[PDB]
Amino acid sequence: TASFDIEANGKVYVEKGRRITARHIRQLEKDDVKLIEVPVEYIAGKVVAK
Amino acid sequence: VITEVSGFVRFTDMIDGQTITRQTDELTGLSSLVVLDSAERTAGGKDLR
């Protein structure tokens, strides 16, 4: 699920609280982007590697 | 859940974003409100029922 807003280059792709459908996945394939904006509250749920 | 009396319904201790999730289904028929379970909620709403 998408708990945060996915933003890249001023264009809105998936809003907050929206489910990810394969049409949005195909839009992400057609957009060719690899850098979005992520808030601070999402980082604390990850696990460090080294 | 079935009620025994008929009258006005009011929302008591229901705030959006913490204990209830308002999701929009892709079909036009379903637009309903879901009550969040008391396990995966935040620490600020443990006593809010």
Curated annotation (Swiss-Prot), chain A:
What post-translational events are described? Acetylated on several lysine residues in the presence of glucose.
Q: Say how it is used.
A: Co-administration of salinamide and rifampicin or salinamide and myxopyronin suppresses the emergence of resistance to both antibiotics.
Superkingdom of origin organism? Bacteria
So what family is this one in? Belongs to the RNA polymerase beta chain family.
What's this protein's function?
DNA-dependent RNA polymerase (RNAP) catalyzes the transcription of DNA into RNA using the four ribonucleoside triphosphates as substrates. Resistance to the antibiotics salinamide A, salinamide B, rifampicin, streptolydigin, CBR703, myxopyronin, and lipiarmycin can result from mutations in this protein.
Oligomer status and interactors: The RNAP catalytic core consists of 2 alpha, 1 beta, 1 beta' and 1 omega subunit. When a sigma factor is associated with the core the holoenzyme is formed, which can initiate transcription. The rRNA transcription and antitermination complex (rrnTAC) consists of RNAP, NusA, NusB, NusE (rpsJ), NusG, SubB, ribosomal protein S4, DNA and precursor rRNA; S4 is more flexible than other subunits. In pull-down experiments interacts with CedA.
Task: Indicate what this protein is called per its UniProt record.
Answer: DNA-directed RNA polymerase subunit beta
Species of origin reads Escherichia coli (strain K12)
Q: What is the lineage of its organism?
A: Bacteria, Pseudomonadati, Pseudomonadota, Gammaproteobacteria, Enterobacterales
Gene for this protein?
rpoB
From Swiss-Prot, chain B:
Uses in industry and biotechnology: Co-administration of salinamide and rifampicin or salinamide and myxopyronin suppresses the emergence of resistance to both antibiotics.
Record note on quaternary structure: The RNAP catalytic core consists of 2 alpha, 1 beta, 1 beta' and 1 omega subunit. When a sigma factor is associated with the core the holoenzyme is formed, which can initiate transcription. The rRNA transcription and antitermination complex (rrnTAC) consists of RNAP, NusA, NusB, NusE (rpsJ), NusG, SubB, ribosomal protein S4, DNA and precursor rRNA; S4 is more flexible than other subunits.
Protein name, as recorded: DNA-directed RNA polymerase subunit beta'
Q: In UniProt terms, what function does this protein have?
A: DNA-dependent RNA polymerase (RNAP) catalyzes the transcription of DNA into RNA using the four ribonucleoside triphosphates as substrates. Resistance to the antibiotics salinamide A, salinamide B, rifampicin, streptolydigin, CBR703, myxopyronin, and lipiarmycin can result from mutations in this protein.
Kindly provide the PTM information from the record.
Acetylated on several lysine residues in the presence of glucose.
Residues included from the entire protein: 1027 to 1075 of 1407
Q: Which family does it belong to?
A: Belongs to the RNA polymerase beta' chain family.
Q: Which residues form a coiled coil?
A: none
Organism, per UniProt?
Answer: Escherichia coli (strain K12)
Q: Which domain of life is it from?
A: Bacteria
